């Protein structure tokens, strides 16, 4: 047993309306789905590299959002906004590197970076879910925004805010802005058989965190499981 | 033998919208202070009556301008400056004894006695302000019917306010009375136009809207099926409280954040608040339109939000360019859930199938009604010779779809009017040239259909 | 529900033995800290404790007594906090 | 590895679009997604940032041989030819 | 007899009377203030009531009972606080009619019979217990109006940098056990103001309440009061609430943080918040002066990097505001220069100098100095001299040059 740390590669197993891991349909589709028939904890899915996420700290997107709004709706102002956004990105990278390896405590804010697509998981409160119209949409964004902020809350009464998160625990991923925890709905996609939607709505869904790789072991100088190599 | 029975706060300014060993001595002094406060209230009433009498005298002698100088002199002469108000003084030393008594009582252990002494001391040096406030609160009536209406309205408002302040026992005997009070108020408030204006002014003076909003603010369960009617009548009361009254509209707009909740009844109240009020339509903030568009997208497709958006665009005839541009920009961003159009062959077939059932009249709240309202809103967003909204909406509804839906035999007058208005405001009446309108054989088919419609009108009238 | 927790007059037997399992990381199996959440296992049956919703005083108007038992499997949520009581109390 | 995965996904989606065009009917949303994927492929092959510059007018200094080989091997060119052929062989 | 005409005439007469009777109301309030100042004159000289009033018993009883009645009679407490504030203010004239009414009332009631006067009144109120009253009210109240009135009364008491009032405040904070609650309330309000400012970026009450609080802290730390300067940073309690860091955070958030410091400072500053920014700069300067090494180090090395915003305030020019209102910009730059001097008064070390120079580059500083010198033509109808501002900036540059070779080379004339 071990505590969860920033930079660790983990997988999330849903135990709600449906049971299974959370995966993606590809690098061109921004829909997150759960496939119960793919596998379970004892028999993980064969394409398990699609179910891996990296725990990341909070990121700032104020300058980026201002620049995006400016683009949507002068040259000097745009140049200054672009420079501010670049500086904010550099500062976020520096802060992430500084806080790399820190322990994760309940009630903190984290971001889930799907590694295969290198995309942060985001919740959009301004758009309903494609299938569950009463829910809110969940997608993957390369740059990310404030919708990627997720409180990690204790699902068990024996865990309290401020306590360190232990590997193998079941937690609740609550978007900061949307306010409705991630839910693995029972609706099935009409194009991908066996895949269930992931949205944001009130529910009792829990996510079990299974450790795949430690932050210390996640270094690009050693042979590691899941690495693609040529013989 | 000592009963410390405390009634309503004696040392409270009148308003239209209403252990110690020497305990015996302390209570006697407190009761004397209460009596003095009552006498001061009576004196205030007498001063108000004197002001009303002098105003009536001036009015009758001027209208069988007005001498505001003499009015002010008489109004100032009653506040102890001269001997004219000497008899109104409650002391034989020009208030010295009263002030000394208040100061002496302020230095006593008895906390309520000190509080009353301080209240009287502060009221002593604020006679003019209190008199002006009371005179402002005064209501003038001409008929015993008006007096009876005032009395019944005041009693009903007091009972409803008392129930709302204790709305914990019914959120069975507190439902019938509340619904009856709301129904009676709604029935009585609206009569003609002059009586309507008088009732609106009286209700604004007595602050009924405050109690009405407090009735809505009460926490409640999702499903009751009984207090829903109470809220339905409460919203109707507010809707009637705004008709042709920009002052009431602004007063209820000051509390607009209460109506920014998912619901259909609140949409009607917002529409009535913003109806024919340019000062509010032109200054409407972004979040209101954002919230309405979000409700259209997520909650569902309903005609109330479209009606609100349409009424906000134009106020007092003049169109609001900012509202047009913002509404178009926010509507075009969301598609297939808010801006639904039937341009594909299958969508057109579905439109014809659903419209064939509207031969005897379009059903209210129906998807066809929603589509008509959406088309009308898009057309109205471009009725200002704008260059942005027109080109933005030209793509949503191509002229080919317009002509196809207009020339079809099974097409109804409502949709025909909507499409013709759209192709007039968004295509023809534009400040920039459009290739499709003129360098294409589309508008000529519409002209032929217009001639056919004229012939149909001729035949129908002859029949 | 296979086994039910009860009280026996004598604690000299083997059925009255229990073992504690931590709910969080511990310092290389050091002393048990005060005010801790633990999982109880029965040494004889090797079963973990659970609390069921079946009342024991259903005959009463408002049952308040809830039954408990043991099962061979373990549940990560069925943890008990050991709250210390002051010697003064 | 991510470039290879993106190439495979793009090839699959373009094949699906070609099959839909062969069937005869393509939805407006599907057409928009196809156009977006085509622009993404243009940028991916050009190996230049998407800074709002016009997609149809991009000048490349040094071509990316790895990207070109990925396209050829994953058959994105085949799907491009299919998209060019199917619409003209009524639609 | 027309109802509409009658209503219109009633409105007209009401407006006329309301406009005409205001000075009389003001005179009556002033007479009440005078009566509170001298209550004993209503009693016989040999009377025990007269003796108790002269000794100050009446005002002490009023102050004591205000705290008790605050729970129920909130309006009465507000009126008492406003009356105390008026007592702590200088005389005012209300026109000839108002003066006549005031004279008549004073003759009727009180038949018998300046910075120094203000200080004496403040000392009298402190003796009677005004300071403890305001402290307890701020600590325990829940009404925004009462909190504002208490803050205003404290500001009036501390006006002029009254050393006795500062000593009384410090003693009360040290002795009373609720000082922790007082500082917690202040910190919570500052954090809420920062949050609302960040969210909005019309000014809300949460951000408008900052101005009186900043003024109160500045008055507390006036006259280089080392004890209060250190107490506001760290207290001898279980939980410590540092207010200097919160003030720096508020300044950074209102100025735009990194985005504002990267050349976009002008956008976040307008004619509505420039006064608040100036007040914040003055409060920071008051904290730093004395000098207070701990406060200077905290401000310089705070993680918020507000030193970058401070340097930007002198380097960059607010594009929109400066075009139509240059006096405010000049005052802001002067305040920033004074704050930098306060931070670099007597620091023989080099950490602060290096941290400042990281953002304040030598060439840009020299260019700003030259621009300030040449902008004397903008002095027309202005109280702040651009030449004086440039001279202060040059003094700062000279002090920084002790650790930078390039700046020393650049500052040498031709």
Curated annotation (Swiss-Prot), chain A:
Residues covered by the MIR domain: 101-161, 162-212
Tissues where the protein occurs: Expressed in intestinal crypt and villus epithelial cells.
Posttranslational mods: Phosphorylated by AKT1 on serine and/or threonine residues.
Compartment list: Endoplasmic reticulum membrane; Cytoplasmic vesicle, Secretory vesicle membrane
Coiled-coil segments on the chain, per record: none
Family recorded in the similarity comment: Belongs to the InsP3 receptor family.
UniProt domain comment: Composed of a large N-terminal cytoplasmic domain (CD) followed by a juxtamembrane domain (JD) and a transmembrane domain (TMD).
Noted disease: Charcot-Marie-Tooth disease, demyelinating, type 1J: An autosomal dominant demyelinating form of Charcot-Marie-Tooth disease, a disorder of the peripheral nervous system, characterized by progressive weakness and atrophy, initially of the peroneal muscles and later of the distal muscles of the arms. Charcot-Marie-Tooth disease is classified in two main groups on the basis of electrophysiologic properties and histopathology: primary peripheral demyelinating neuropathies (designated CMT1 when they are dominantly inherited) and primary peripheral axonal neuropathies (CMT2).
Entry function: Inositol 1,4,5-trisphosphate-gated calcium channel that, upon 1D-myo-inositol 1,4,5-trisphosphate binding, transports calcium from the endoplasmic reticulum lumen to cytoplasm, thus releasing the intracellular calcium and therefore participates in cellular calcium ion homeostasis.
Assembly mode: Homotetramer. Homodimer. Interacts with TRPC1, TRPC3 and TRPC4. Interacts with TRPV4. Interacts with SIGMAR1. Interacts with PML and AKT1. Interacts with IRAG2 (via coiled-coil domain). Interacts with CABP1. Interacts with TMBIM4/LFG4. Interacts with CEMIP. Interacts with TESPA1. Interacts with TMEM203. Interacts with BOK; regulates ITPR3 expression. Interacts with BCL2L10. Interacts with CHGA and CHGB.
Protein name: Inositol 1,4,5-trisphosphate-gated calcium channel ITPR3
Residues of the full protein shown: 5 to 243 of 2671
């Amino acid at each position: 047993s071990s505590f969860l740390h920033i930079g660790d590669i983990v997988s999330l197993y849903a135990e709600g309306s449906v049971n299974g891991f959370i995966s993606t349909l590809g690098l061109v589709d921004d829909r997150c789905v759960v496939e119960p028939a793919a596998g379970d904890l004892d028999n993980p899915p064969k394409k398990f590299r699609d179910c891996l996420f990296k725990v990341c700290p909070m990121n700032r997107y104020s300058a980026q959002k201002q620049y995006w709004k400016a683009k949507q709706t002068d040259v000097v102002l745009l140049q200054k906004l672009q420079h501010a956004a670049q500086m904010e990105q550099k500062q976020n990278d520096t802060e992430n590197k500084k806080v790399h390896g820190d322990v994760v405590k309940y009630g903190s804010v984290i971001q889930l970076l799907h590694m295969k697509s290198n995309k942060y998981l985001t919740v959009n409160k301004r758009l309903p879910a494609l299938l569950e119209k009463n829910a809110m949409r969940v997608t993957l964004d390369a740059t990310g925004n404030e919708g990627s902020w997720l409180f990690i809350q204790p699902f068990w009464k024996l865990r309290s805010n401020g306590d360190n998160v232990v590997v193998g625990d079941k937690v609740i991923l609550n978007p900061v802005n949307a306010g409705q925890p991630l839910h693995a709905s029972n609706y099935e996609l009409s194009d991908n058989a066996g895949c269930k939607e992931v949205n944001s709505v009130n529910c009792n869904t829990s996510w079990k965190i299974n450790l795949f790789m430690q932050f210390r072991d996640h270094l690009e100088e050693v042979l590691k499981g899941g690495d693609v190599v040529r013989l | 033998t000592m009963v410390l029975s405390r009634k309503q706060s004696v040392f409270s300014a009148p308003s239209l919208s209403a252990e110690n060993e020497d305990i015996v001595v302390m209570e006697t002094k407190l009761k004397i202070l209460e009596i003095l406060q009552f006498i001061l209230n009576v004196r205030l009433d007498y001063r108000i009556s004197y002001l009303l009498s002098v105003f009536k005298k001036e009015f009758v002698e001027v209208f069988p301008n007005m001498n505001l100088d003499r009015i002010g002199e008489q109004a100032e002469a009653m506040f102890g400056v001269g001997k004219t108000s000497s008899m109104l003084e409650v002391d034989d030393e020009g208030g010295r004894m009263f002030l000394r008594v208040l100061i002496h009582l302020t230095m006593h252990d008895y906390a309520p006695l000190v509080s009353g002494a301080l209240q009287l001391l502060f009221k002593h040096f604020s006679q003019r302000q209190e008199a002006m406030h009371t005179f402002k609160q005064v209501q003038l009536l001409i008929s015993a019917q008006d007096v009876e209406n005032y009395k019944v309205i005041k009693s009903e408002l007091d009972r409803l306010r008392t129930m709302v302040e204790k709305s914990e026992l019914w959120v069975s005997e507190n439902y019938q009375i509340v619904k009856g009070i709301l129904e009676r108020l709604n029935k009585m408030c609206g009569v003609g136009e002059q009586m309507r204006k008088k009732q609106q002014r009286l209700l604004k003076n007595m602050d009924a809207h405050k109690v009405m909003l407090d009735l809505l603010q009460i926490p409640y369960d999702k499903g009751d099926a009984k207090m829903m009617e109470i809220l339905r009548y409460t919203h109707q009361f507010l809707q009637k409280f705004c008709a042709g009254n920009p002052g009431n509209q602004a007063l209820l707009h000051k509390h607009l954040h209460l109506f920014l909740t998912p619901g259909l009844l609140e949409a009607e109240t917002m529409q009535h608040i913003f109806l024919n009020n340019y000062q509010l339509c032109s200054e409407i903030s972004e979040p209101v339109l954002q919230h309405f568009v979000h409700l259209l997208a997520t909650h569902g497709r309903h005609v109330q939000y479209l009606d609100f958006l349409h009424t906000v665009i134009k106020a007092e005839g003049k169109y609001v360019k900012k509202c047009q541009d913002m509404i178009m920009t926010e509507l075009t961003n969301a598609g297939d859930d808010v801006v639904v159009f039937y341009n594909d062959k299958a969508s057109l077939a579905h439109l014809l199938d659903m419209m064939k059932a509207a031969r005897d009249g379009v059903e209210d709240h129906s998807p066809l009604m929603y589509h008509i309202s959406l088309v009308d809103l898009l057309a109205a967003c471009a009725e200002g010779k704008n260059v942005y909204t027109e080109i933005k909406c030209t793509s949503l509804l191509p002229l080919e779809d317009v002509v196809s839906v207009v020339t079809h035999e099974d097409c109804i007058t409502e949709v025909k009017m909507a499409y013709v208005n759209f192709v007039n405001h968004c295509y023809v009446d534009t400040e920039v040239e459009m290739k499709e309108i003129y360098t294409s054989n589309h508008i000529w088919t519409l002209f032929e259909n217009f001639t056919l419609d004229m012939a149909r009108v001729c035949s129908k009238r002859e029949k | 529900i296979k086994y039910c927790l009860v009280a026996v007059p004598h604690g000299n037997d083997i059925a009255s033995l229990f073992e504690l399992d931590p709910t969080t990381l511990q310092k290389t199996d050091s002393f048990v800290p005060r005010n801790s959440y633990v999982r109880l296992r029965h040494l004889c049956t090797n079963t973990w404790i659970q609390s069921t919703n079946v009342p024991i005083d259903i005959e009463e108007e408002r049952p308040i007594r809830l039954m408990l038992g043991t099962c061979p499997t373990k549940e990560d949520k069925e943890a008990f906090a050991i709250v210390s009581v002051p010697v003064s109390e | 590895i991510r470039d290879l995965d993106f190439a495979n996904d793009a090839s699959s989606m373009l094949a699906s679009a070609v099959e839909k065009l062969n069937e005869g009917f393509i939805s407006q949303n599907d057409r928009r997604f196809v156009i977006q994927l085509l622009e993404d492929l243009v940028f991916f092959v050009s190996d230049v940032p998407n800074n709002g510059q016009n997609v149809l007018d991009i000048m490349v200094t040094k071509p990316n041989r790895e990207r070109q080989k990925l396209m050829r091997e994953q058959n994105i060119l085949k799907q491009v030819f299919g998209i060019l052929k199917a619409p003209f062989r009524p639609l | 007899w027309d109802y509409k005409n009658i209503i219109e005439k009633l409105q007209d007469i009401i407006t006329a009377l309301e406009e005409r009777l205001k000075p009389l109301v003001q005179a009556e309030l002033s007479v009440l203030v005078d009566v509170l100042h001298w209550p004993e004159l209503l009693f016989l000289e040999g009377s025990e009531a007269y003796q108790r009033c002269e000794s100050g018993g009446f005002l002490s009883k009023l102050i004591q009972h205000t705290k008790d009645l605050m729970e129920s009679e909130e309006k009465l407490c507000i009126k008492v606080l406003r009356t105390l504030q008026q007592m702590l203010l200088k005389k005012t004239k209300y026109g000839d009619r108002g003066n006549q009414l005031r004279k008549m009332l004073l003759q009727n009631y009180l038949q018998n019979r300046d910075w120094s006067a203000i200080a004496a009144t403040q000392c009298r109120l402190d003796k009677e217990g005004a300071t403890k009253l305001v402290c307890d009210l701020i600590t325990s109240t829940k009404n925004e109006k009462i909190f504002q009135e208490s803050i205003g009364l404290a500001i009036h008491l501390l006006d002029g940098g009254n050393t006795e009032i500062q000593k009384s405040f410090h003693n009360l904070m040290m002795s009373d056990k609720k000082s922790e609650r007082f500082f917690k309330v202040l910190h919570d309000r500052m954090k809420r103001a920062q949050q609302e400012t960040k969210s909005t970026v019309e000014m809300g009450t949460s951000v408008l309440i900052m101005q009186p609080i900043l003024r109160f802290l500045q008055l507390l730390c006036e006259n280089h009061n080392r004890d209060l300067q250190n107490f506001l940073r760290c207290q001898n309690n279980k939980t410590n609430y540092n207010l200097v860091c919160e003030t720096l955070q508020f300044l950074d958030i209102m100025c735009g943080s990194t985005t504002g410091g990267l050349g976009l400072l002008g956008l976040y500053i307008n004619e509505d918040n420039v006064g608040l920014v100036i007040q914040t700069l003055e409060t920071l300067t008051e904290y730093c002066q004395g000098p207070c090494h701990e406060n200077q180090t905290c401000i310089v090395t705070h993680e918020s990097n507000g030193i970058d915003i401070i340097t930007a305030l002198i380097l960059n020019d607010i594009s929109p505001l400066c075009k139509y209102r240059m006096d405010l910009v000049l005052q802001l730059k002067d305040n920033a220069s004074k704050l930098l001097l306060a931070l670099m008064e007597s620091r023989h070390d080099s950490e602060n100098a290096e941290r400042i120079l990281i953002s304040l580059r030598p060439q840009e500083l020299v260019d700003v100095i030259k621009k300030a010198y040449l902008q004397e033509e903008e002095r027309e109808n202005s109280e702040v001299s651009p030449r004086e501002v440039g001279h202060n900036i040059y003094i700062l540059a000279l002090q920084l040059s002790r650790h930078n070779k390039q700046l020393q080379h650049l500052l040498k004339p031709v």
